Amino acid sequence: RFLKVKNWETDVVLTDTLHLKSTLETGCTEHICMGSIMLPTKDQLFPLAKEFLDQYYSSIKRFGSKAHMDRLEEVNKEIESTSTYQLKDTELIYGAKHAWRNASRCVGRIQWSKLQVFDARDCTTAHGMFNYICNHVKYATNKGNLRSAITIFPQRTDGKHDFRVWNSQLIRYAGYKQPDGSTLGDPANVQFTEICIQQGWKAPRGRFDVLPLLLQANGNDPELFQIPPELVLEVPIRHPKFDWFKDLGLKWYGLPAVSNMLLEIGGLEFSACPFSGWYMGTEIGVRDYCDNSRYNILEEVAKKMDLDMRKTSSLWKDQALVEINIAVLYSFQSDKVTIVDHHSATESFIKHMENEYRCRGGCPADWVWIVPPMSGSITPVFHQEMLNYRLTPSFEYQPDPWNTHVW
Template sequence: WSNLQVFDARSCATAKEMFEHLCRHVAYATNGGNIRSTITVFPQRTDGRHDFRIWNSQLIRYAGYQMPDGSIVGDPANVAFTELCIQLGWTPKYGRFDVVPLILQANGQDPELFELPPELILEVPIEHPTYEWFEELGLKWYSLPAVSNMLLEVGGLEFPACPFNGWYMGTEIGVRDFCDAQRYNILQDVGRRMGLETNKISSLWKDKAVIEVNLAVLHSFQKRNVTIMDHHSATESFMKYMQNEYR
């Protein structure tokens, strides 16, 4: 809390202005990799028919494309949202890591589409400290996890658009984004390349492989001086925070 930067965007009136505020948020929060905790607060809800909303779940996410053969290119979690972007006029690129545009709604008006300038988006190519083949997987991830679809309630006032960010914990990317079966699902490929018994669950090949994926994520972010936390440090940090709150 003591380090949270609050940007007051309550005087915002149009989707274009919303976009300008969000560009400022991304640039400030990314800070060349030295991530800063930030929240931007857009106008409060009035009668429920003039809401300011960000339709994206995060300010930066990767597109997911359902192909004619049923396969998915990109992030399967974002297939429906990507389809919505295409319906609103976005031109799909059909890559594995295409950043989806922002869908912004101001004052209850129709949603509008905006693309974040590529120079604002800091991405980290994923490599492993010892497995040289890891780079062949062609993985990367964005450095700024900015949640944008939650409602902030303060003293009875509701703010439907209030994107905020901290920084990543390594397992969020390594386990959830890369290894979940319903996401990028790279675990089998990694296990095979490591020479593990991937046809035998009791060999614990998944446990071995996921550790190396997590290690690769932490190594890659740290190598490029981008803020990230391992799950052990995060646990210790949270317990200290709890102790301070209870004082």
């Protein structure tokens, strides 16, 4: 019930108490561990609200004050007559900041407290959503000096009037099925590309086609919008020693911006709440470029390096993987667009973790997502035990909305 985590490279032991305030379920039992599964009324709403306001008022050093009790009352009365309630601004900011503080999969949480929150709760149409979004993108991009941010659309009401961003990320490249039967562009987005084309998008039918936004206001059918090209900062990818690298025609976008999650604060659900930070190199260089199911360019790169591709044991995939990632890092840096490498990101999180242990009594952390997808055991997170548990406020993953929306 008080739990220890050991770092096996340093012998630092941390004691976790924070887990006891754990509320949601993990998917694990004492019989089966699900650590590597990607997806494991007025009545219920008041405890949730209470649990949240309690932590808020504690955080502002006013637990059990006149102002604390007064708010519990007001919220309680609002639920009883309206069946929901509204967060104060200051509460909203705190909820969003803490949702990221609680995100057990996120290696970049050292920054959780620097999050600019944009209150789009007064939003009513897809056009409003687009406007808010363009502002988010421009503010966050900051000409390349990236700033973390989240934009929060109106909370779920009765589930029939949800605001949703249909894209999974604000900025993503189109994927298209080809005559030969292979894939042009990003295969991750085939399904969504076709929907866009089917909503009406004039697809340029290229390899790095920035997709249109699909915006749903008040549970209405969604509409398309192109993001002003001048707002989409992109980076052409070159190697600091391989001259031919640039001839591959590779580019990536500077702004990672998750747009499909559901944000839960004090029992209220914000179903459209797109957020953005900045890339860790490996997310582009390892996953976007190299995954079998993604742009998958290892064979092409390995050939240009004239490596021995006859046997897996020449470690040609590995050698090419490193060079691809040097190139991502080098390009972003050369163009002055913020990026971090896995070494410094993981070093940063270790410091963050130790901060959260002395300041908060722990830090939920999912080791399967925290350890980088290349060079695992030479980053310090590999040797660090982590406890994974669900705390609220949180971000949850949610069903791709076309399986869920009626047309």
